[PDB]
Amino acid sequence: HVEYTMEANEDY
Amino acid sequence: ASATLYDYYNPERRCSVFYGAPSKSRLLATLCSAEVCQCAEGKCPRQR
Amino acid sequence: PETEKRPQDAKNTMILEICTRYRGDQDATMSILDISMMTGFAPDTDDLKQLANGVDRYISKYELDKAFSDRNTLIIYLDKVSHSEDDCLAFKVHQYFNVELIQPGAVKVYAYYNLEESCTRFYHPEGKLNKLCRDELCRCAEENCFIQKSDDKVTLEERLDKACEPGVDYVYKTRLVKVQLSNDFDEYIMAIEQTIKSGSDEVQVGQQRTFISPIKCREALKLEEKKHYLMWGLSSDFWGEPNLSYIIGKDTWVEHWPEEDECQDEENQKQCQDLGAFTESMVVFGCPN
Amino acid sequence: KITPGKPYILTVPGHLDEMQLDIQARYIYGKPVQGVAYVRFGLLDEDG
Amino acid sequence: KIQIQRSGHLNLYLLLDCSQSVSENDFLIFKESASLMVDRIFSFEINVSVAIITFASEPKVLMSVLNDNSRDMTEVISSLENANYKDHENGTGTNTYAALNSVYLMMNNQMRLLGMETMAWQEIRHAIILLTDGKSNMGGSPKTAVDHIREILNINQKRNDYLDIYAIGVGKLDVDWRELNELGSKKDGERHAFILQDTKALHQVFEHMLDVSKLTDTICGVGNMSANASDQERTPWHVTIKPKSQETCRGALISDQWVLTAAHCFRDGNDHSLWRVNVGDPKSQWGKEFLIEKAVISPGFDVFAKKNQGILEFYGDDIALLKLAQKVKMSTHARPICLPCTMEANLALRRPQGSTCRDHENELLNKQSVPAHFVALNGSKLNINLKMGVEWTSCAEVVSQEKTMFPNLTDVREVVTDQFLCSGTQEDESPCKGEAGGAVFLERRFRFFQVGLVSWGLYNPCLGSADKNSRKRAPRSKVPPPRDFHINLFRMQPWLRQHLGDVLNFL
Amino acid sequence: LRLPYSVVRNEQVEIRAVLYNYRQNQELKVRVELLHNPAFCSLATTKRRHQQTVTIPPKSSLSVPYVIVPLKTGLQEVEVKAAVYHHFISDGVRKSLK
Amino acid sequence: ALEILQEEDLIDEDDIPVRS
Amino acid sequence: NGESVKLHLETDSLALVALGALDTALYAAGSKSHKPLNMGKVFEAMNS
Amino acid sequence: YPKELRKCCEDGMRENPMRFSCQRRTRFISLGEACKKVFLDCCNYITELRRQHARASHLGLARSNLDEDIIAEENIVSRSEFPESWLWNVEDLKEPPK
Amino acid sequence: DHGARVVLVAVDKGVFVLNKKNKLTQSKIWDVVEKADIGCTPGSGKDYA
Amino acid sequence: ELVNMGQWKIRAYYENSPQQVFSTEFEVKEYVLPSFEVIVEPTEKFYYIYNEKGLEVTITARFLYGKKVEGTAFVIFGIQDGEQRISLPESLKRIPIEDGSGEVVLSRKVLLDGVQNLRAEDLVGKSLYVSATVILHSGSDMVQAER
Amino acid sequence: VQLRVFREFHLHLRLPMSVRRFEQLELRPVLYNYLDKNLTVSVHVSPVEGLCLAGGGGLAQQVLVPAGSARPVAFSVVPTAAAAVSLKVVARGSFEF
Ligand SMILES: *[C@@H]1O[C@H](CO)[C@@H](O)[C@H](O)[C@H]1NC(C)=O
Ligand SMILES: *[C@@H]1O[C@H](CO)[C@@H](O)[C@H](O)[C@H]1NC(C)=O
Ligand SMILES: *[C@@H]1O[C@H](CO)[C@@H](O)[C@H](O)[C@H]1NC(C)=O
Ligand SMILES: *[C@@H]1O[C@H](CO)[C@@H](O)[C@H](O)[C@H]1NC(C)=O
Ligand SMILES: *[C@@H]1O[C@H](CO)[C@@H](O)[C@H](O)[C@H]1NC(C)=O
């Protein structure tokens, strides 16, 4: 599992 | 990210391979067709 | 009179002139001038060297190094002081740090072998002007001599609560007689009109007392001639052992009591009745707590 | 830079001296280099 | 950066948004901004061609670069003045592609004329200034037109300096910063797209949007006007005279190798050796020092000539000239100052050829209170008001009050000769001691002219040695009111001409 | 940090900090700061510390004046912390005022 | 976000010289 | 980088100094040593 | 002037800060009558000379700064204050020699 | 040399330069020794004696 | 803090043979500390009368912390006939000190015309002296040097 | 005359000689931190036409470089331009350091 910030390109 | 493997006696004999995150792809997405290879990186739209 | 030669750092230059005479029949055997100097001031060493080493030799020698635990001192060794006429010498003192509310410097001349014969005088450059009145800098300086209340939105309940706290041991309603403003501490002679409560100091109606205030609080107090005021303070705020002077400390309150003829205006009727009710409540009912 | 302990090796039948080398890595601006040195040995004749 | 030099041509294409997205007030802001830009550009008296294309859903051309009248300031100003906001009511959409294609059509028509192979077209540089919010909603992407523009001029890496596209959005209107940045050209070390609030900020930014560094000819008056420049850049003509390691009197460069200074600085010195004139230098902040080979003193100057009559000091004919032993290499830090009664002053004022300095005097000093400036000790610029006409009569009367220095009546005819100008009245500054000779100049049409030099006064506000910067203020009760004076250059024309007839060209 | 020898209590004195730049053709961009001290109310109150960004010309020096009014007696420390930009220099000088 | 993030409290990025 | 460096040149008469500043990583890049023109080469030239 | 009288006249021209006419200053000279005479003559000469210079070449309305002359003095004294020496310790080498 | 005693001192180098009149140097020490030689004539004499 | 000012000495001798005393001397002097150090010296150690190049002097200035000085130096030469200094007025020069070092030349013609003597050999034995005054370019600091 | 230059904190970028267009490559700028204070910086590459960056182009990566150490940051890039590009990588530290 990897944690991202201000990257996830899925809205809502 | 990347991962290379050199040959000890002749380092010029290498092999470089790209690998991706545990769920993403190994190469950047790109819309390529004949001469044009328009980029397709960013966000994907929603069904409003 | 003229800048002439001035050090680069020096902000201004002034000339200090000293004249001394011996009142006795014969000249003093040997005398010494101890000159204590104000903040940021340094003498012009060229002038002193010219006075001493020169052919004229007005002064035997000068010494700028001492203990001087309080302030920088200069010691001048005079061979003799002439009784017939005044002996005068002058030299230039330069200031390097600009200063406001500067305290006076002292000059003391004494005979070395008999220290009984000494004379002391004080010199200070010739209302007061400050250099830092801003939103917060003007408040830390004026944070003393007063209570945190701004004397503009005083409520009856707050005044009653802060009036006779167990720390407070006296509350007075007095009138100002005269203002004796001085260089370091201002004297305010308060004529006592009525004492609401009494503490360790005994006073009578119509008697006079004197209050001493720091110079930095002159503008904050902004007291006026022939006006009424109300002050309450601590038990240890008495300075006299005779004089019975009082000191305006951090727990001393000052409210300008409006005049009787001015109590009928819109800006003073809202406060005259409150002050009267407060005074009557503490005179008769006393302090509930 | 590879620097031998001595610029020669004594192959006299009586004895053979020690073979020791010092390898130093240095950035161009002076600071030392952190890394792993992989060294290989062999014989080489005047022919090549 | 819009390059400035004497070789080549500069085709300026001013595009103004005329769509629904800009209101009438915003269009007035754009129009006055374009007027200011076109006025400033012509001040350098260079070869410039300006084309105005206000654009909307369709492109409308107001003035053509191909037209031979593009090299006239007044014609372009009038053509821009006749612009109308309601001319695009039928189509109120923003069509950037229409404007860019109109500019391309103009450029192609110019290219066909005169021949592409000719060097005259090759030496032409281009500058497109677009005043818009950037929201172009139809006509096509601006990138296609921009690439077409680059390809017609074959703008490669080597020729990257031959095309500059700006995008300035000025006014209350909302501006998309990303779109404006994309519209502007992309260069490594400069900004090409700006967002502003009013016209003064645009004047400052446009002052930064040029570079006169490549210009080195002997032009007078031209100088910086941005507030973010060094004090010497704003007044390049300011030079100083140093007798012996001291900073005594100021001056003004009037030519390549001449300086004009007050004559009471050289009171007791005839050994021009050890005298150095400090001149500003582009590299060092302390300037380059020159040697004087000939100092000329006005023969009519004598301070104590009227001593017996009651005039302790009389400052008539207080003027001197200096000739540096080396030619000053004109740069961005040292340029001459325009003197009146000469051809160059006439050219800088855009006056007719058959002018005479009798007209110059009225043109430059018409008002009863003419604003003027002089340079302070630290290099800053202060403001004064030269008073002429009947207002001058009251001025000299104040001198009669100062009877402590001259006990006589000292009316205007006696002490204050007509060669002197008023100053220091009401909200006016006074020179300190050490600013004698500094030019008292004035600005007209973005060019500086010299109309006198400081001579004397009645109060020194630098008496207190607080710093070289702190200046005292005269109390309102100070018994002699401050009333300064300056030698008037116009009255000294007979002396000027015979000493500088060859160097300059007087009317 | 330039200070007077001794400043009397309740005297308004303008101590200063002189920053010297010794680079031949470089301009430092320092961020001077005055640490709060309970003894005297500096321009830096307890809530917000006072910081100034000053640029020193090459081969020159710049003086940052500060105003402190002492309301306590004895010896107290006056400290200014300066951090240079892109030069790593974090020199700060502390002195004792009587 | 395993650790903290110092966003928008960094240098202006305009005062950092570019080496080319 | 970007600093100003004061370079002093001194001779015994008027001379045409031929200056040149060279990177040092070039020597590391080069497979074989290529010594420059020093006084040894000049002395060999004179006595040849 | 002779060598021994040079010091007597050199201090006769510099002006003391008390603004004393040299007739009164001569009373303080503890030397021979020759020194008093030389002092008085030099002081009167330089007083008249400098009064004439300040009357002629100084103007109150000039707006030009007064000329300044480099002192170009004599008797220059060389430096005599240098930082104190440190590292006043002795050691014995005892490691095994190579 | 092994077992030796070394003594140090640090100077400003502004006073070292002006000390050219006399410094503690090995040459000075050996000159002081050379000033006490038994024979003084450089290299020859009139006879063998 | 209060000692005799002059040249002090240190005497050392073995107890057995007090006839041999070894001495080293130092100075006490008085506290002096200029703003910066300036050194004035000619290239040669003398002056040759028939040397048309004149006497060249190299003025050097540097701060107390190492960095150089950029300013202006005023230099004036002067003959010295034993103990009388016939200062030369025409030899006063102003030179710029850049990088921290300057240079000034006294022409032979100036020196010959200063003493109004037609014979050049008459100046033998009359030593010269140089006085220099260095003024900083930033402020008003001034120091003086002589040789 | 040897004359060395140094920064004590810098970015080192070493591009290959040339790269075929449309072929993915990886940039590995390395931060060198020779200061005595442990640091933390944010590194991002400025977007430009012709480069198909990852995430869009404006994103930045947080990376911390200990005292006297180095750290690389990988940036996958597929150059879709025609002739050449000019790519810039910016590393910006904190206001504390
Ligand atoms: C400007 O254009 C004119 C008219 O074509 C030409 O004569 C002149 O040489 C050009 N250059 C300058 C610097 O005026
Ligand atoms: C002028 O400089 C200041 C900083 O001193 C800056 O904020 C301002 O934007 C600059 N003005 C222009 C027009 O560039
Ligand atoms: C004005 O000054 C600025 C700042 O130095 C300079 O960049 C600009 O080119 C100047 N503009 C002119 C001379 O038009
Ligand atoms: C220069 O001096 C003037 C004197 O009036 C002063 O107002 C101004 O602030 C100074 N400018 C500076 C220090 O930049
Ligand atoms: C920086 O990082 C190290 C671990 O890499 C940590 O132990 C240390 O406390 C940090 N701070 C320093 C070295 O000042």
Would you say K71 and K143 are in contact if contact means Cβ atoms under 8 Å apart? no
Tokens of B10: 């002749």
Own/partner contacts of C251-256, CB < 8 Å, gap of 24 or more, are C251/C147, C251/C167, C251/C168, C252/C145, C252/C146, C252/C147, C253/C146, C253/C147, C253/C149, C253/C162, C254/C146, C254/C151, C254/C221, C254/C223, C254/C229, C254/C230, C255/C151, C255/C154, C255/C229, C255/C230, C256/C151, C256/C227, C256/C228, C256/C229
- Can you list the positions of beta strands (E) in F22-86? 28-34, 50-56, 60-65, 76-84
CB-CB neighbors (< 8 A) of F59 in chain K: 70, 138
Q: How far is CA E127 from CA E16, E33, E167, I81, in A?
A: 14, 16, 11, 65
User: Which of the listed residues E226, E330, E331 should we mutate to test ligand 3's pocket, taking the one with most ligand atoms within 8 A of CB?
Assistant: E226
Separation CA E29–CA K94 (nearest Å): 57
Residues 6 or more apart from D4 whose CB is under 8 A from it? D20, D21
Separation CA I37–CA I39 (nearest Å): 5
Tokens of E90: 């039928």
Gap between the terminal Cα atoms of chain J = 43
Q: How long is chain L?
A: 97
- By C-alpha distance, which of C89, C80, C86 is closest to C30? C80
> Does the CB of B18 have a partner CB in chain L at under 8 Å?
yes
Nearest CA in chain L to A8: L55
Protein residue whose Cα sits closest to atom 8 of ligand 4: E469
Q: How long is chain D?
A: 48
Own/partner contacts of K21-24, CB < 8 Å, gap of 24 or more, are K24/J22
DSSP alpha helix (H) spans, E402-481? none
- By C-alpha distance, which of E234, E122, E161, H5 is closest to L4? H5
Would you say I35 and I5 are in contact if contact means Cβ atoms under 8 Å apart? yes
Residue F92 β-bridge partners: F81
Q: How many CB pairs under 8 A join C and F?
A: 69
The residue with tokens 């009664």 is E341
Strand pairing report for E163-169 and E193-195: parallel
For residue L81, give the amino acid letter: A
Would you say E88 and E128 are in contact if contact means Cβ atoms under 8 Å apart? no
Tokens of K100: 């921290």
Protein residue whose Cα sits closest to atom 1 of ligand 2: E228
Which of L26, L56, L74 comes nearest B41 by C-beta? L56
Could you give the 3-state DSSP secondary structure of residue E455?
Answer: strand
Separation CA C190–CA C208 (nearest Å): 6
Could you give the 3-state DSSP secondary structure of residue F80?
Answer: strand
Kindly list the strands in the beta sheet with E124-131, ordered across the sheet, starting from the edge strand earlier in the chain. E59-63, E48-55, E9-17, E124-131, E163-169, E193-195
Separation CA F85–CA F29 (nearest Å): 6
Residues 6 or more apart from I50 whose CB is under 8 A from it? none
Taking CA E423 as the corner, what is the angle to CA E420 and CA E426, rounded to the nearest 5 degrees? 155
Tokens of E266: 């050289």
- By C-alpha distance, which of B31, B30, B26, B28 is closest to B16? B26
> Does the CB of C8 have a partner CB in chain K at under 8 Å?
yes
Would you say E351 and E345 are in contact if contact means Cβ atoms under 8 Å apart? no
Separation CA C72–CA F7 (nearest Å): 11
Q: What share of chain E is helix, strand, coil (3-state, %, to 5)?
A: 25, 25, 50
Separation CA C63–CA C65 (nearest Å): 6
CA dihedral E218, E220, E226, E230 (to 10 degrees): 70
Give the max Cα distance, chain C: 83
Could you give the 3-state DSSP secondary structure of residue E112?
Answer: helix
Separation CA E485–CA E318 (nearest Å): 11
Would you say C237 and C215 are in contact if contact means Cβ atoms under 8 Å apart? no
Separation CA E190–CA E160 (nearest Å): 13
Phi and psi, residue D40, nearest 5°: -130, 145
Could you give the 3-state DSSP secondary structure of residue L55?
Answer: coil
Would you say F52 and F85 are in contact if contact means Cβ atoms under 8 Å apart? no
Strand pairing report for E447-456 and E485-487: antiparallel
Subunits that touch chain H (at least 3 Cβ pairs < 8 angstroms)? D, F, L
Q: How far is CA F40 from CA C101, F9, F66, F96, in A?
A: 16, 10, 12, 13
Resolution as reported, in Å: 3.5
Separation CA H44–CA H27 (nearest Å): 24
CB contact under 8 A, A11 and B21: no
Tokens of E364: 């430059």
Instruction: Tell whether the torsion through CA atoms of C140, C141, C146 and C150 is positive or negative.
Output: negative
- In SS3 terms, H1-48 reads as CCCCCCCCCCCCCCCCCCCCCCCCHHHHHCCCCCCCCCHHHHHHHHHC
Q: How long is chain F?
A: 98
Would you say K41 and K49 are in contact if contact means Cβ atoms under 8 Å apart? no
- In SS3 terms, chain K reads as CCCCCCEEEEEECCCCCCCCCEEEEEECCCCCCCCEEEEEEECCCCCCCCCCCCEEEEEEEEECCCCECCEEEEEEEEEEECCECCECCCCCEEEEEECCECCEEECHHHHHHHCCCCCHHHHCCCEEEEEEEEEECCCCCEEEEEC
Taking CA C244 as the corner, what is the angle to CA C242 and CA C249, rounded to the nearest 5 degrees? 160
Could you give the 3-state DSSP secondary structure of residue D48?
Answer: coil
Phi and psi, residue E52, nearest 5°: -110, 120
Would you say E50 and E36 are in contact if contact means Cβ atoms under 8 Å apart? no
Stretch (H or E) spanning E79: helix E73-81
Stretch (H or E) spanning E102: helix E96-112
Which of H1, H21, H24 comes nearest L7 by C-beta? H1
* Cβ(E143) – ligand 1 distance below 6 Å: no
Separation CA B25–CA B21 (nearest Å): 7
DSSP alpha helix (H) spans, chain C? 45-53, 137-142, 156-163, 218-221, 266-280
Would you say F1 and F80 are in contact if contact means Cβ atoms under 8 Å apart? yes
Would you say C142 and C248 are in contact if contact means Cβ atoms under 8 Å apart? no
- By C-alpha distance, which of I39, I64, C179 is closest to E248? I64
Breaks (C-N over 2.5 A) in chain J follow: none
Which of I17, I18, I39 comes nearest C55 by C-beta? I39
User: Do the two chains C and J touch, given a threshold of 8 Å on CB pairs and at least 3 pairs?
Assistant: no
Separation CA E376–CA E436 (nearest Å): 10
Could you give the 3-state DSSP secondary structure of residue E224?
Answer: coil
DSSP-derived secondary structure letter, C269 = H
- By C-alpha distance, which of C275, C264, C169, C186 is closest to C222? C186
**Chain C nearest CA to F88, separation (Å):** 30
Tokens of K131: 């006085």
Would you say C55 and I39 are in contact if contact means Cβ atoms under 8 Å apart? yes
Taking CA E10 as the corner, what is the angle to CA E5 and CA E12, rounded to the nearest 5 degrees? 140
Strand pairing report for E124-131 and E210-211: unpaired
Residue B15 β-bridge partners: B5
Residues 6 or more apart from E320 whose CB is under 8 A from it? E260, E261, E262, E263, E265, E266, E295, E296, E297, E298
Could you give the 3-state DSSP secondary structure of residue C193?
Answer: strand
CB-CB neighbors (< 8 A) of D34 in chain L: 70
**Chain E nearest CA to C96, separation (Å):** 11
Q: How long is chain E?
A: 507
Phi and psi, residue I74, nearest 5°: -125, -175
The residue with tokens 């005839």 is E270
Tokens of L19: 């790269």
DSSP-derived secondary structure letter, B22 = S
Tokens of E414: 């006696």
Separation CA L82–CA C236 (nearest Å): 90
Separation CA E167–CA E146 (nearest Å): 13
Tokens of I11: 């201090």
- In SS3 terms, E376-422 reads as CCCCCEEEEEEECCHHHHHHHHHHHHCCCCCCCCCCCCCCCCCCEEC
Subunits that touch chain B (at least 3 Cβ pairs < 8 angstroms)? A, D, L
Experimental technique behind these coordinates? cryo-EM
Separation CA C187–CA C176 (nearest Å): 11
Phi and psi, residue I45, nearest 5°: -60, -50
- Can you list the positions of beta strands (E) in chain I? 90-92
Tokens of E161: 């300096």
Would you say I42 and I73 are in contact if contact means Cβ atoms under 8 Å apart? no
The residue with tokens 């190094």 is C65
Separation CA B39–CA D16 (nearest Å): 66
Separation CA E16–CA E5 (nearest Å): 27
Q: How far is CA E186 from CA C43, E181, E192, in A?
A: 63, 8, 7
For residue E39, give the amino acid letter: D
* Cβ(L38) – ligand 5 distance below 6 Å: yes
DSSP-derived secondary structure letter, I14 = S
Name the CA radius of gyration of chain H, rounded: 16
Separation CA E224–CA L48 (nearest Å): 35
- By C-alpha distance, which of K138, C95, C85, C261 is closest to I27? C85
Q: List residues near ligand 3 (CB under 6 A).
A: E 207-208, 210-212, 224, 226, 229, 233
Q: How far is CA F22 from CA F53, F56, F57, F59, F61, in A?
A: 18, 10, 10, 5, 9
Separation CA E223–CA E215 (nearest Å): 12
Stretch (H or E) spanning I42: helix I33-56
Q: How long is chain C?
A: 289
- By C-alpha distance, which of C187, C179, C176 is closest to C230? C176
Kindly list the strands in the beta sheet with F28-34, ordered across the sheet, starting from the edge strand earlier in the chain. F50-56, F28-34, F76-84, F92-97
Which of I12, I17, I28 comes nearest C92 by C-beta? I17
Q: How far is CA E221 from CA E41, E207, E224, in A?
A: 15, 16, 10
Separation CA E309–CA F57 (nearest Å): 54
- By C-alpha distance, which of C150, C148, C141, C151 is closest to C215? C141
Separation CA D5–CA D23 (nearest Å): 11
Among residues 30-59 of chain I, which lie with CB inside 8 Å of chain J?
none
Separation CA E131–CA E193 (nearest Å): 10
Subunits that touch chain J (at least 3 Cβ pairs < 8 angstroms)? I
DSSP-derived secondary structure letter, C53 = H
- By C-alpha distance, which of F15, F3, F12 is closest to C138? F12
Phi and psi, residue C64, nearest 5°: -95, -5
